Design a protein around this ligand. Sequence first.
Ligand SMILES: O=C(O)[C@@H](c1ccccc1)S(=O)(=O)O
Length: 106
Amino acid sequence: SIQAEEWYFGKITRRESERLLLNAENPRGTFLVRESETTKGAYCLSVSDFDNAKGLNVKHYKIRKLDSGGFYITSRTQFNSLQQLVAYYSKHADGLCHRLTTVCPT
Ligand SMILES: O=C(O)[C@@H](c1ccccc1)S(=O)(=O)O
């Protein structure tokens, strides 16, 4: 049950995810998973980042889910569940702006 996950914010917009993530108290990797605004069957991983050039900022990554079962941001790296995907990216930055750290406070 992905709806049961505390990091799943459901039906919130890209702008709302940015409002939540752009809080100065959020360290790099603060994140949430929400519905994609324009891709049916897809989710979006929103993550906070911070650097001396941009300061506090937010990146969004589309998560695809196959009818064949797999979940992925890049098709070369798939998972059997969204929970497994989140756990993997909490340990590996790979192409993300930062590894996933803490769930975005509301
Ligand atoms: O449509 C989407 O899933 C989202 C998205 C994610 C990354 C890039 C473009 C669009 S959005 O919900 O932020 O627009």
